[PDB]
Paper text:
Fatty acid-binding proteins (FABPs) are involved in the uptake, metabolism and intracellular trafficking of fatty acids. Based on epidemiological studies and animal knockout models, the isoforms FABP4 and FABP5 were identified as potential diabetes and atherosclerosis targets. The aim of this study was to develop a dual FABP4/5 inhibitor and, to this end, high-throughput and fragment screens were conducted with X-ray crystallography as a follow-up method on those ligands that showed appreciable affinity and favorable physicochemical properties. Structure-based drug design (SBDD) based on initial hits from high-throughput and fragment screens yielded 216 ligand-bound structures of human FABP3, FABP4 and FABP5 isoforms, many of which were at resolutions of better than 1.2 Å.
During this exercise, 229 FABP crystal structures from various human and mouse isoforms were determined, many at better than 1.2 Å resolution.
Numbering used by the authors: 1 to 132
Write the structure that this text describes.
């Protein structure tokens, strides 16, 4: 399950992430620190349970979830959201909802890369990772 995604992934490019975080409502100071962080993303699977960690000097976070089962999450920027993650077309698609708002984070394998596209109200950021 989700075999392709398993690994340790290091950030290699980031496009439009500051504007994405502005749209989400992340504060100035936090955007500054989060933008200069170069997180590793560590994805593992155990039976039907998927775990994603994001590790950086900014913060360490971890979510554990089942596909297609809504779960509560505190994000790196301290939002309390309801999240649902699904496998569609080989991409892992995460929707976060809070306070009448919504954002989508898509993680797709493209060659030897993991491409992460984050969208909120038509503002899109793209972050590309490769295996560490």
């Amino acid at each position: 399950m989700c075999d392709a995604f398993v690994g340790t992934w290091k950030l290699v490019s980031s496009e439009n992430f500051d504007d994405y975080m502005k749209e989400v409502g992340v504060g100035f100071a936090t955007r500054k620190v989060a933008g200069m962080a170069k997180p590793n993303m560590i994805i593992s699977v155990n039976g039907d349970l998927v775990t994603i960690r994001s590790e950086s000097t900014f913060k360490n976070t971890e979510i554990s979830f089942k596909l297609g089962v809504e779960f509560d999450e505190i994000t790196a920027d301290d939002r309390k959201v309801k999240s649902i993650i699904t496998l569609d077309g080989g991409a892992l698609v995460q929707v976060q909802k809070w306070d009448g708002k919504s954002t989508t984070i898509k993680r797709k394998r493209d060659g030897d890369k993991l491409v992460v596209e984050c969208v909120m109200k038509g503002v899109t950021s793209t972050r590309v990772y490769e295996r560490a």
